[PDB]
C-alpha cells in the first residue's frame, strides 16, 4: 500500500497527493481515488483529456503549473469533476482559455500563458468564480481582447487580476462584488470617473507600472510619452469608500490630488514609490487626508542630479496619526538634522523608519530619542562615517532579522562607511537592543569601550568586517550580549578568542568563515552559557595544543564543524567535545573514517550530521554506542554496504538518511530487525541500486513496513540492468 | 637532434637551456655540452654530485631553485669541477648548511629561504670573487644566526650582502668596505650604533626595515618591540655613509626622526618611512630641511589609531625638498584636502607624482592641483569623494599607480574606488588638462548625456570599468572629442560613431543580449573591439535576424574579441558580415561545435584565428584554398581527433599551429606528407591522448626530418596507451 508516484498525506482530515517535480509524461492513473487535492506541477505532461482525472471525483483542487517543464487541453476535460473548486493552469503555453471548464470552479489561475482573448464562451459560464488570475498573458502582443460584459455575469468575483497585459483601458462592466482589482503594468494612461464607479466593496486597487519610472525592474519598462504620469480623474475614486490598499508605484506622478482621498477614510496602505514626488513630500495637501494610514511608502522618488543637504518633510506629516511604518528609501540627501523629522516625533504608532539607500553622510542620532515609540531604525546603505505572485515595488521581507528585532529597539547601520568605531559613534542613541554593523569594512581593534554608549545590546551583527579581537576585553562592555555574529571576519585570522568567557548570558556565537587556523596563548574556547557555536569555514584540520579546543563550552548543545577540510578527526579530539551536545554537524568535510564507538560519551546526542563526506564503513553494533540518536544524516558519501543489525537495535532512530551513496542492495541480514523500531523515515534516492532478483528481499521489507516512509520514490532508480535502468526500484517483478 | 628534456635557445650568441617545471627526478645528462646557462628550477631533483654537471664545462649560470618542488642533498665539491661558474642559485632547497667546496669563480650566490643557521668561513671565506650574496629567509621565526667573526672580511669584492628575515639581533661586525648594498630587513636589530656602519664609505643602499615593526597585514610574522619601542639608531650611526642614496626605514615604529642622521648624507635619493608613527614629524619635522637631493619620499601608513583629523598637517619645511619627484602619503587618514594644506609642495619643480590613496578623504578642493608646477600623476584611489615573493619590495607599491597606456597620454587623475555614485555638474571643475581619467569601481549609475566631462574635454583614455553607467543617449561621452581608449568592462550603442579618434573600445562583461532601435555598431576609426562576456548567442538567431551585421560598420577594425559569448553556432551570414580588415580574431572559450573554414576566404588580412576552449571536431581538407595569410592558428582544448591530409602542408603562411589538449591519438603518414615547403616554426601537441604503438613511428620520423618545426613542452606530450608507455614522452620510444 505504498503510494506511487505521489506522496499521499492526510492534511486536516483530507488526503492530499503531492506529485510535483517527478518527470511524469502524463497524469498517473495510480493516484488514490480518495484524494481531495492533487499537485502535478513541474512535470512533462503534454495532454489533458476527459479520461485524465477519472475516478477522482472528490478532487477539489488541481495544480498543473509549468507543464511541460505547450499543454493540450481538450474541451470539457475537467467537466466530469463536480467538486472541483480550485484549478491552477499557470505557465502552460495555453493559446486560449480552456473551453468547457466545470461550473463549480471558484479559483482559476491562468497566469503567464498565451491567452489574448477573454471571451464569454470560457468565462461567463463560471458563475461561482471568486478569484480570477489572468496575469502575464498579452505581455510584450498587440492588446488583449476583453469581450464587452465578460465579467458582468460573474456576480461572485472578489478578485480580478489582469496585471502585465496590454490593456490600454480599464475593462468596463465589472461586478460590484469585486474586493481586489489588480491592473499593474497594463498600459493604462487614463483613469476616468466611470472606470471604477460601481465598485463600492473594493478594498484593494493596484494601478502600478502605468507610465513607469524605470529603475532596475525585472520586466520591460517603457515610459509614457514626454514624461507623462498616470492621468487619474479628480472623482475617479469618489465611490471606493472601503479602499484599504492603494498601489500607485511607478506611475511618474509629480502631483497628488488630495480629492482622491476625500471619500477614502479607511486607506491603510499607500504605495507612492518610483515617482517624482519630492515636492509633494515637502508640501503635499494629501497628507491631511490620511488619518487611518498605517503604511506609507515614498521610496525612490529622487530628482536626478539633485543631492540636497537636507530632506524636506512637510509639516502635514503630523496629520498621519495612524502611521506605523514610513519608507523613505532612495530620496538621496546628505544630512539628517534633528529639526528635519519634527513632523514625525509626536506620532504614537510610528515604529518603523526606513531610510535605506539614501547616501546620507551625517545623521544627528540624538533625534531618534525624541520619537514616541521607535522599534526599527533602518539606515543600511548610507555614507555614515566614524516571481509573478510577489510584490514587485515594495520590500516584503523584514528590514531586520526577527531574531534580532525581538530583543528590543533595532538600529541597522550595515553597508555604511564606518571603517572604525569612533568614540562618539553611538552617543545620544536610545536603548538599542539589536545592532547591525555588517559590511562596513571595519578594521577596529576592539578594546572594550566602543559600545559603552549602547551597553544593552543583546544581538550584535558584526558580519563582513576585518575586526581585531586579540584583546580579552573586546565587546565585554555589552554584559547582556546573547547573540554575537562574527561571520566573514577572516582578515584578522596573535590570534585570540579569550573575550568569549567574560559573557554571562552569551548563548549563540557564530565564527563562520573566519579561517581560524591558529590561536595564540590560550588555545581553548571557554564559556558557561554558550548553547550554540558555529565554527564552519574555519581550519580545524590545521588545529587538529588544540585537542580540547571546545571542552570549555560546558553548556553547548549545538555545534557546527562543517567546511573545515577535515580528513580525519583524532579520537581524543572527538572525546573532548562537550558531553552536553544534542546536535552535531560535521557535514561538507573530507572524512574517510568515523569512529562510531566514541558516540558512547555523548548520551544526549539526537542529531549527527555527516553529509558530504567520503565515509565507507558503518559499525555493526550502533545500539551499544548510542541510545538517543534520533536523526542520522549520511547523504553524499561513499557507503556501499549496510551492516547486519544497523536498521534494528537503535530504537531511538526515527530518521536515517542514506541518499546519494553507493548502495547496490540491502540484503536479508541487514534488514532482519529482531526488535521493533520507531524509524518513521528512510531516504534512499540517488543510490546505484542493482535491480536484479537480489533487491526482492528489500522490496518485501518495504511492503511489511509501511510506517517507514521512503520519500522521493521516483528518484530511487535502478542502475542495472539495461531493461531496468532509469526505472524506480518499487516498479519491478 | 631535438633537445630533450630542456628547450635549448641561443640568446645573444650564448645557448641557454630552459629545463624548469618538468618533473625531473635528477639532473639530465642529455643537455648539450655547449650551453652556458642552465635552469633546472621547480623539479624533483634530490641529489647533486660532482658527476651531475660533467662535460658542461662552459656553464656560467646554474639555477636549482625549489628542488624538490613542495631536501636537496649536495655533496662536498659537487660544483668544484665548473671553472667558468659565476652565478649559482640555490633558493628554497631545505639546505641545512652552506655547501662545502663551492667553486672559487662564483660572483653571485643565492641561498634564500633555506635552513642555514651558520655563516661559516669554511664555505664563505674561500669565495673571494663574490659580488652578490643573498642569504635571506634562513633563520626566520635556531635561536639566532651564528655569523663567524670576520666571515665577510675576506670577501673584499662584495657589493651586495642580504641577510634579511634572519634572527640576527646585532649588525655583523667586520663587513668589507666594498659594500654598496646592505639588506637587514626583519632581522630583530633593536639597536644601531656608531660602530655598526663605520667603515662602509661606498654604501649606496641601507635596508633597516621591519626592525621593531608596526604590524599591518604583512604576509610574514610581525612581533613588535617591547613596550611599543622603535629602532634605536645612534646620532652618529650614519656619519660615514656619505654616498647613501637609498634608505629603507619602513615598519620601524619610529616616532621621532633625528635630523643629524642626514647631515653627512647629501646624496639621499630615496627615503622610505612607511608604517611608522610619524604624523607629528610630517607636521614639523626638522629632517625635511636636510634632504635637498631627495627624489622619492614615502610617508605612507603613518596614521594614529582613532585619529581622523579634518585636514592633513604638512610642515612648511616640505618646500625644502627641492628635488622631490614623487610623494607617497597613503594611509595618513584625514577628512579634507584644502588648497592651503598643500601650499609647501606647489613651488617644487620636479614634483610629478602625488599619491594620496587609502586616506578616507571625504572632500578635496580640486582647484589646488592647478597651482602645481608639473603634476603628471594624481592618485586618489580608495577615498570617499562624493558627487560634485622574497625578491620584491614588501613595504612599497612598485607597480605603476596608473597603467602606462593611460599615463602616456598626459596628466592622469585616478578617482577609482571612491563614493561617486553619480557625476555631479561640478565634479571636474577647476581641474588641470586631464588626458587620462580613472573612474573605476565607483558604483556609478549616471545616465550619460554628453555634458558630464565638459570641464576636462581632452581626456584621451577613459577608464569607467566596474560601474553601472547608462549609455542609451547617443550623446554619451561625445563631449570628449579626442577620446582614443574607452574602457567599459563590467558595466552589466549609437554614441560610438560620433568619435573621430576612438581606437580601442572594451565592452567586456556587459551582458549585452539586446540592442534597441539601432542594431549595428558603427565607427570609422575603431581598431580594436573587446566584446567578451556578452550574449552574442541571443543576438545571433534564425528569428531575430536584426543583428546579422552587428560589427560590419567597424570598417577600420583589425582586432576583435568574441570570447565567452556562449556561442554554440555562428550563422554563415553573420561570420561573412565581420570586418574584412580583421587581422586578429578571437572566438575562444565558447561552445562551437562546427566552424566553416570556407568563410575565411573573405578575410585576406586575417593573421591570427583563436578558436581555443571550444568543442570543434572537424577540420577542412584544403585550408590553403581559403587562407593565404593566417600565420597563427590556436585550437587548444577542443575535441579534434583527426588531422586531415594536407593540413600541415599547403598553408605556407602558417608559422604557429596549436593543437594541444585535443583528442589526437596519432598523426598518420598522409596527414604529414607535406608536398610543398613550410615556414611552420612551432607546433604545440601536449595533452593529447597519443596511442604510442608502432603507428606513432611515422610522426616520430617527421620530427627528426623537420627540426625547424619546434615542438614545445616535450615532457608533456605523453603516451596514453599502452600500460608500459603510459606517462612517458612520445619522443622517448623504440
Ligand atoms: C501593489 O501593492 C499591493 C499591496 O498594497 C500588492 O498586493 C499584494 O500582492 C502580493 C503578491 O501578489 C500578495 O501576496 C500573496 O498573497 C496570497 C494570499 O494571501 C492571503 O492568504 C494567505 C494564506 O494563504 C494569508 O497568510 C494572507 O495573510 C492573505 O490573507 C498568498 O497566498 C501569497 O503567498 C505565497 O506566495 C508568496 C510569494 O511567492 C510566498 O512568499 C508565500 O510563502 C506563499 O507561497 C502572497 O503572500 C498580497 O496579498 C497582496 N496584498 C493584498 C492586501 O492583497 C501588489 O502586489 C503591489 N503590486 C506590485 C506590482 O508590486
Ligand atoms: C550565524 O549563526 C547563527 C546561528 O546558527 C545563524 O542564525 C540562525 O539562523 C537560522 C537559519 O539559518 C535560524 O533558524 C530559523 O529560525 C526560523 C524562525 O524561528 C522561529 O520560528 C520557529 C518555528 O518555525 C520557532 O520554533 C522558533 O522558536 C522561532 O520562533 C525558523 O522558521 C526556521 O525554520 C525552518 O528551517 C529549519 C532549518 O534551518 C527547519 O528545520 C524548519 O523546519 C523550518 O523549515 C529556522 O529554524 C536561527 O533562528 C538563527 N539564530 C539566531 C540566534 O539568530 C546566523 O544566520 C549565522 N549567520 C550567518 C551570516 O550565516
Ligand atoms: C627597502 O627599500 C629598498 C629600496 O631602497 C628595496 O630595495 C629594492 O628591493 C627590490 C627587491 O629585492 C629590488 O628589486 C629587484 O632588483 C633586481 C636587480 O635590479 C637590477 O638589475 C635589473 C636587470 O636585471 C635592472 O633592470 C634594475 O634596474 C637593476 O639595475 C632585479 O633583478 C629584480 O627583478 C626581478 O624580480 C622582480 C620581482 O620578482 C620582477 O618583477 C622582475 O621582473 C624580475 O624578475 C628586482 O627588480 C630593488 O633593486 C631594490 N632597490 C635597489 C635600489 O637596490 C627593499 O626591497 C625594501 N625592503 C623591503 C623589505 O621592502
Ligand atoms: C579592455 O580591453 C583593452 C584592450 O584589449 C585592454 O587593454 C590592453 O590590455 C593588454 C593586456 O591585456 C595590453 O597589452 C600588453 O601591453 C604591454 C605594454 O605594451 C608596450 O610594450 C610592448 C612590448 O612589450 C609594445 O609592443 C607595445 O607597443 C607597448 O609599447 C605589453 O608588454 C604586453 O605584452 C605581454 O603580453 C602579451 C600578451 O598579452 C604577449 O604577447 C607579449 O609577448 C608580452 O608577454 C601586452 O601586449 C594592451 O596594451 C592594453 N591596451 C590598451 C589600449 O590599454 C584592457 O585591459 C581591458 N580592460 C579590462 C578591465 O579587462
Ligand atoms: C545585517 O545587515 C546585512 C546587510 O543588509 C544583512 O545581510 C543580508 O541579509 C539578507 C537576508 O539574509 C540577504 O538576502 C538574501 O541573500 C541571498 C544570497 O545572496 C539571496 O539569494 C536572496 O535573494 C536575498 O537577497 C542579503 O544578501 C544579506 N546581505 C549581505 C551583504 O550579507 C543581515 O541579514 C542583517 N542582519 C540582521 C541581524 O538583521
Ligand atoms: C583604474 O583603477 C582600477 C582600480 O584600482 C584599476 O584596476 C586594478 O588594476 C590592477 C592592475 O591591473 C589590479 O591588480 C591585480 O589584480 C589581480 C587580480 O585580482 C591580482 O591577482 C594582482 O595581484 C593585482 O592585485 C586590480 O585588481 C584592479 N582592480 C580592479 C577593482 O579592477 C585599473 O587598472 C585602473 N586603470 C588605469 C587605466 O590605470
Ligand atoms: C540624485 C541622483 C541619484 C542617482 N542614483 C542612481 C543610483 C541609485 C540611486 C538609488 C536611490 N539607488 N541607486 C542604485 C544603487 C544603490 C546602491 C548601489 N551600491 C551598492 O550597493 C554598493 C554596496 O557596497 C558598497 C558600495 N556600494 C548599487 C545600486 C549604488 C547605486 C540614486 C543618480 C544616477 N544618475 N544621476 C544623475 C543620479 N542622481
Ligand atoms: C584613524 C584610524 C584608522 C584605521 N584604519 C584601519 C583600516 C585601514 C586603515 C588604512 C590606512 N588602511 N586600512 C585597511 C583597509 C583599506 C581599504 C579597506 N576597504 C576596501 O578596500 C573596500 C573596497 O571598496 C569598497 C569598500 N571598501 C580594506 C582594508 C578598508 C580598510 C585605517 C583604524 C582601525 N582601527 N582604528 C581605531 C582606526 N583608526
Ligand atoms: C468521496 O468521499 C466520500 C466521503 O466523504 C465517500 O463516501 C465517496 O465514496 C468518495 N468518492 C470517491 C469517488 O472516492
Ligand atoms: C496605536 O497603535 C495601537 C495598536 O498597537 C492602536 O490601538 C492605536 O489606536 C494607535 N493609535 C492611533 C492614534 O492610531
Ligand atoms: C522633541 O520635539 C519637539 C517638537 O515635536 C521639540 O519641541 C522638543 O524640544 C524636542 N525635544 C528635544 C529634547 O529636543
Ligand atoms: C585592551 O583593553 C583594555 C581594556 O580597555 C585596555 O586597558 C588595554 O590598553 C587594551 N590593550 C591595548 C593594547 O590597547
Ligand atoms: C545553559 O543554557 C540554558 C539555555 O540557554 C540557560 O537557561 C542556562 O542558564 C545556561 N546555563 C548556565 C549555567 O548559564
Ligand atoms: C575508536 O576510539 C577508541 C578510543 O580512542 C579507540 O580505542 C578505537 O580503536 C577506535 N576505533 C576505531 C574503529 O578506530
Ligand atoms: C666552450 O666554448 C668554446 C667556444 O667559446 C669551445 O671552444 C669549447 O670547446 C667549449 N667547451 C665545451 C666543454 O663545450
Ligand atoms: C627637475 O628635473 C630635471 C630632470 O627632469 C632636473 O634636471 C632638474 O635639476 C630638477 N630640478 C631640481 C631643482 O632638482
Ligand atoms: C598658488 O600658491 C601660492 C603659494 O605657493 C599662492 O600664494 C597663490 O595664491 C596660489 N595661486 C592660486 C591661483 O591660488
Ligand atoms: C540626451 O542628450 C542630449 C544632449 O545633451 C539632451 O539634449 C537630451 O535631453 C538627453 N536625453 C535625455 C532623456 O536626458
Ligand atoms: C584606422 O586606424 C589607424 C590606426 O589607429 C589610423 O591611423 C587611421 O587613421 C584609421 N582610419 C581612419 C579612416 O580613421
Ligand atoms: C560555409 O558557408 C557557405 C556560405 O554561407 C555555405 O554555402 C557552405 O555550405 C558552408 N559550409 C559548411 C561546411 O557548412
UniProtKB/Swiss-Prot annotation, chain A:
Which residue numbers delimit the LRRCT domain? 687-733
- Name the coiled-coil region(s): none
Instruction: Spell out the subcellular localization from the entry.
Output: Endosome membrane
* Recorded superkingdom: Eukaryota
Activation and inhibition: Activated by RNAs having enough uridines.
Q: Which GO terms describe its biological process?
A: canonical NF-kappaB signal transduction; cellular response to mechanical stimulus; defense response to virus; immunoglobulin mediated immune response; inflammatory response; innate immune response; negative regulation of interleukin-12 production; positive regulation of canonical NF-kappaB signal transduction
- Maturation and modification: Ubiquitinated by RNF216; leading to degradation by the proteasome.
What happens upon changing residue 302 to A?
A: Abolishes activation of NF-kappa-B
- Glycan-bearing residues: 12, 50, 58, 72, 117, 201, 239, 247, 312, 316, 349, 370, 436, 471, 502, 510, 555, 595, 667
Effect on the protein upon substituting residue 359 to A: Abolishes responses to both ssRNA and chemical ligands
Q: Which UniProt keywords apply?
A: Disease variant, Disulfide bond, Endosome, Glycoprotein, Immunity, Inflammatory response, Innate immunity, Leucine-rich repeat, Membrane, Receptor, Repeat, Signal, Transmembrane, Transmembrane helix, Ubl conjugation
Please list the residue ranges covered by the LRR repeats. 83-104, 105-125, 128-147, 156-177, 178-198, 201-222, 242-263, 266-288, 292-314, 322-343, 349-370, 373-386, 407-428, 431-452, 456-476, 480-497, 505-526, 529-545, 555-576, 580-600, 604-625, 628-649, 652-673
| Keyword Ubl conjugation in annotation | yes
Task: Please give an example of a GO cellular component term from this record.
Answer: endoplasmic reticulum membrane
State the tissue distribution.
Answer: Expressed in myeloid dendritic cells, monocytes, and monocyte-derived dendritic cells.
Q: Topology: which residues are Extracellular?
A: 1-733
Q: How does it assemble?
A: Homodimer. Interacts with MYD88 via their respective TIR domains. Interacts with UNC93B1. Interacts with BTK. Interacts with SMPDL3B.
Disorder noted? Immunodeficiency 98 with autoinflammation, X-linked: An X-linked disorder characterized by onset of recurrent infections associated with lymphoproliferation and autoinflammation in the first decade of life. Mostly males are affected; carrier females may have mild symptoms. Features include mouth ulcers, fever, poor early growth, hepatosplenomegaly, lymphadenopathy, polyarthritis, and non-infectious enteritis.
Q: What does this protein do?
A: Endosomal receptor that plays a key role in innate and adaptive immunity. Controls host immune response against pathogens through recognition of RNA degradation products specific to microorganisms that are initially processed by RNASET2. Recognizes GU-rich single-stranded RNA (GU-rich RNA) derived from SARS-CoV-2, SARS-CoV-1 and HIV-1 viruses. Upon binding to agonists, undergoes dimerization that brings TIR domains from the two molecules into direct contact, leading to the recruitment of TIR-containing downstream adapter MYD88 through homotypic interaction.
Q: Which family does it belong to?
A: Belongs to the Toll-like receptor family.
Full protein name: Toll-like receptor 8
Protein source organism = Homo sapiens (Human)
Gene coding for it? TLR8
- Full-protein positions shown: 31 to 818 of 1041
